[PDB]
């Protein structure tokens, strides 16, 4: 069958890191303090390169224990996020975030159903209260193979996808990256929003789509809240 | 079909964490017991909190080797589940309780006029003060979506159905287990947890197994591991940490 | 179809370690003869909770890497079993015993009171036997569109077990097995512990029972975990380096 | 059915290791100087054997927490490959290359579809900006079972899938290698691109290609920039 | 249907090691020299086993991170095995030699007095080839809707191994099998040992092998691991830092 097409937009790295708190405790508070100097310093690039408008990124902590904070940054290219990881790991900071799991990708537009595309395609990253982020392929499985569906099937269940979705219009923001090719899943979910439990509305809900009930193959999931740089040291604090 | 809807509750944060007995026993005495009365300090404010009906907690000791402590705490906000967890990993204690696993959902009554959320039962599940029973049990669980067996493709008739038989199996347990399910799509990696509270831990495996023969169980269930322990009562937190 | 219904014994832990080997040579001399005095001390006393007939446990050693030692203890309450590893996990012995696995279960079979009859008596508080041999592994029961246990009727369940038991009973006299209860209680449906002092028959049993109906459609199988018996009169030399 | 026959050129180890930059840090400075210093020497002995067209080599970068950094080796026999990774974890450097991954598999033309033999048996790898490797299955399930196809079966489906790979042509080179009995999956698919986005753009159109839709299984997606030996100091300078 | 029935040989132990080559590097040289002493010690009581034809055994290093080294080793009992691996870990070479991957398994001839048979016993008791390769992985066979092995009668699971045999003949005097069984010992049922003088031999066998009916429809495979022999008189060499 036809083939999707894409249009696509900046790089996209997920980085996730759980806290050696215990290890942290042990560090001298004047070390601490510039630990969290230098990563500050750091993330200041990062803004300037966003303000810039070459790039983009959020820092989240994330409940639970499969990770505790999260970086996602955007970035025209597969270099930049490389060169963002390592000066990050060589930060002292970093030698207390242990790694617990990470996400490549592209942002994506596809064939399915200006100004506007370049919003989409070079986000700016919201500042709502919380983030979700999962990792989901389309089954290949018997009757439920969606790369053997006509593409004429394919709009059609996308179509109903999308009516879905808007439902939830100013209530959560969705960004869609793909990557096939570049990572372990097909697509990279990320939802913002101002209240976490329109994440649960909204993936529930698209369950019952059928595009989902019978073509959803999803990974593990990450809840989290902003952490805004100001509450940085009042977070690490110990 | 017709997507199922929900009332939803209190989030739920289920924390469980393994004791590293090797280095606590390395531990001078002193710093043991000031680190026992900075958690149980900790616990008197999630005390507080449950007696203002603000939230709940429960605190148990898991069997077994995949945890050895289960905490399981209800808030209404998800940040202040977060802030729980923060400030429970700054204590002294929480640098012998190694992680084991973790779960976050929101307490959930399905749709399988008046508004349900002002009605007194209803309120009293979406908000619950988790009981006090000898033993726990938590299990996270998804429903089948492979071949004919694919449970969201089913219609919302079909659905209900098929719950009214679960329903059925479940109320022959009334006053022996009590379950607490939360929902956890959009935000962990199963559909639901179950915790199921009962002083006889034989219920838990006389419940499940009896509904396994229900269709919706053994058609559709999707189960994750099974944690089972007993009830931890504060005071005896410094008898269980006693080397 | 009609839910199976079960009678329920004893409550069982298998307790399953690695041995730190490196960390317990740099340990002095004297302080491992006493970590082994601590230790058969406490044996000393599941040793009188089974002489009682409260209890009862089994200490085997396993091989190749998946484990190095098995605890597998029985007891009437889920409390004492926490009680238990909590007194094992603080002694100096279990320091160098790194989780290696662990199955929580119940004593399972499957008018007059059955629970009053002399011989499932046995069964449910069951004297675990001395033999050369153990091996454990976890199962469950296929439930799949096209072969699912749950869906179907009681007399295909009972007629698919009756050959099963014919199997089995070829192997009297040979291999004891000790059929645990796991639904609700860990992660999977039954653990199954197998006696014997010939540990081919293991292979033997399991290997003819995969040829009955219920295990070559329904059986879904867990890890298996071997081991030889670690009487307590060997312990320190076992632990000697 | 018939089963495919095969030309075999070199043997193939994908090393991926994780960087302990946190006790990197902790290194003296002039111990790693010389650490980059042997190990440097020592891909000079690989570069050599290369120029001597007894082998090849390439070092990436690698993208997200999977790895840091990967070593792509080709020698004719598999003792070499041993006595290589040996070398390798005898260095100073690598004590603080801690493992992640690894693939051992065997150049392979099937005869599904002379200088320019030789040159896909022995291959000199391209020094393309990025790179991208994943292994992979053929399925053997319910009515989707490579292996009992016939051989025209096969033959068909593999055309196919040829024609959508001529049209990155100049644009992807893969290098696929057979590991049946040699490593955990049955072929290790290497891609290079000056373009890490022809990654995602090749592979995704390939998955609707029949024999990648119904029979594809694959395991996890590496994708990484390429580390060239004068830039290894800076890499490694902390 | 009917079962398989088994003649069965020495017990078998695949032990798969990583080596800690950086704290290797820390240990004294004379250190080092006195756990490689001790080492080859320890395998000379291994070699006099063998001359007396009372076990065998093979020692190769493996290729990749999955594992450095692999000690094969079969013995007329279980016990001799734990014995083995106890022996080994107690060596000081073992604080450097961590757990990767391990398999218990005992050699198995099919039936699809022949324990007095000279060529039955040479293939019940082997004598392991010092071969250049060696290729290691364990499988089960398919139990899956219709495509279930284990439901196949005995004719027609007979005929699927006719053509298997078929396939491997062809590879006579290239590769030497040795297939062990695992049912009620092991995760899988069956160990695969491959031994050549050619490790593309290994690639040819198993994948010609796979459009063989038996493997292509009910094969279930395991983790490969593939080695180059380590002669003792280069341990010495090869742990030399």
Known sequence: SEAAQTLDGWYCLHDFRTIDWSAWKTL??????????????????????????????????????????????LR????????????????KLADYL?????????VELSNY????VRRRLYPILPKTNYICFYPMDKRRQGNDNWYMLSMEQRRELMRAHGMTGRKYAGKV????????????????????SDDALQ????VYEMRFDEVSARFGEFGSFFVG????????????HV
Chains 1, 4 share one sequence.
């Open 28 to 73: 001298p508070n004047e070390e601490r303090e510039a630990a969290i100097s230098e990563f500050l310093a750091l993330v200041d690039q990062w803004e300037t390169t966003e303000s810039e408008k070459q790039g983009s990124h959020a820092v989240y902590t994330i409940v639970g224990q499969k990770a505790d904070i999260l970086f996602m940054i």
């Open 98 to 106: 242990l790694p617990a799991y990470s996400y490549v990708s592209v």
């Open 113 to 116: 159903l200006i100004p506007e």
């Open 225 to 236: 809240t902003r952490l805004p740089m100001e509450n940085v040291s009042s977070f690490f």
């Open 173 to 192: 923001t969705q960004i869609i990256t793909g990557s096939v090719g570049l990572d372990d899943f097909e697509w990279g979910v990320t939802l913002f």
């Open 76 to 91: 025209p290219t597969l270099d930049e996020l490389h060169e963002i990881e390592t000066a990050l790991n060589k930060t």
């Open 199 to 202: 994440f649960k509305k909204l």
